């Protein structure tokens, strides 16, 4: 019924405070109101930017200019990656820390990179595993090094990518 | 039997082995359940045509 995240712009900030004019003594004088409005409306701008200072620092929306700072703390350097996929690698490596490389587990990680039906996985008798891609939205060669990391120590892997079925 | 027939009810539970319950759809038939007791009641379902219930003979 209520949002748990209380960090939001204050609703109707301006009309508040004006509500503290005692008994409409000054209201309708058009000389005191403008002086008060001009000062209060400055806080509006500062109040608004208080959110982006917290909202924009999250990894989901962080821009490349500062996303590097988030990656730097985790040891994931930009190298030659671009912004749209640099976000992906950060998620992939971080998610690897609570993984076991099971068949059900592997499907889950690939799920975040290719939608619901964009990926499928065949399995083979002698350590063979196969990955199929149908709806890639980013160039895969640069993402490939991580795709190896979350697999068992002895996996034998093939990678094939195509658009659609 | 006990003479006064009683109406069927989907939310009813029977506990008496000798009373007649008048089911209707106005096709009225009278039903009983010998294996009904206070210790082992039975639930009047949507329809009696589906166990322990038996229809009165005509």
């Amino acid at each position: 019924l209520k949002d748990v995240n209380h960090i939001h712009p204050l609703p109707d900030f301006v009309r508040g405070g004006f509500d503290y004019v005692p008994s409409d003594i000054f209201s309708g004088k058009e000389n005191f109101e403008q002086t008060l409005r001009i000062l209060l409306e400055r806080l509006e701008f500062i109040d608004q930017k208080m959110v982006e200072l917290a909202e924009l620092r999250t990894t989901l929306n962080a821009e490349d200019a500062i996303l590097d700072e988030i990656g730097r703390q985790l040891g994931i350097y930009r190298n030659g990656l671009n912004d749209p996929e640099y976000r992906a690698v950060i998620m992939i490596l971080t998610g690897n820390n609570s993984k076991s490389g099971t068949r059900a587990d592997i499907i889950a990680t690939l799920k975040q990179l290719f939608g619901e039906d964009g990926v499928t996985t065949y399995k083979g008798y002698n350590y063979r595993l196969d990955i199929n891609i149908f709806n890639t939205c980013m160039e895969v060669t640069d993402i490939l090094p991580e795709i190896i990391d979350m697999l068992p120590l002895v996996t034998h892997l093939r990678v094939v990518e195509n658009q659609g079925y | 039997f006990k003479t006064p027939p009683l109406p069927w009810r989907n939310g009813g539970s029977v506990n008496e082995f000798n009373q007649l319950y008048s089911f209707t759809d106005g096709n009225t038939t009278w039903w009983y359940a010998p294996g009904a007791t206070v210790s082992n009641p039975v639930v009047m379902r949507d329809s009696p045509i589906n166990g322990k219930f038996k229809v009165f003979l005509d």
């Binding site: 748990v4 209380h6 960090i7 204050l10 | -």
Partner: protein, 112 residues
């Protein structure tokens, strides 16, 4: 790290409570401030008569408050937690802190 429960807290709901407590035979002073917009309790910890508090943090349920601060000579080495007595989904409030109000703020000390 065996630990034993040894102290419990209660709050009257006044927005600027301040009182002195004794833990592990040492004495500390605590300050609690209520935040309106964030509807949460702010806790400050320090030595008796200290110019400034040593530690300030925001209270939350099932979070180890002292975790990153067990490296100072004036900080308790025990465990401080807030967990609910009722439904597990209830979050810390203003008047719902106490041994029977819904949230059990507790301190426990390691066995040495």
């Amino acid at each position: 790290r065996t630990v034993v429960r040894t102290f419990d807290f209660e709050l009257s709901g006044y927005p600027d409570e301040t009182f002195r407590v004794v833990l592990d035979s040492v004495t500390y002073e605590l300050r609690f401030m209520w935040n309106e917009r964030d509807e949460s309790w702010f806790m400050s910890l320090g030595d008796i008569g200290a110019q400034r508090p040593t530690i300030t943090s925001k209270l939350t349920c099932y979070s180890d408050i002292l975790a990153p601060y067990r490296y100072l000579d004036n900080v308790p080495d025990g465990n401080l937690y807030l967990w609910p007595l009722g439904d597990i989904r209830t979050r810390a409030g203003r008047f719902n802190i106490g041994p029977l109000k819904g949230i059990q703020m507790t301190y426990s000390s390691l066995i040495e």
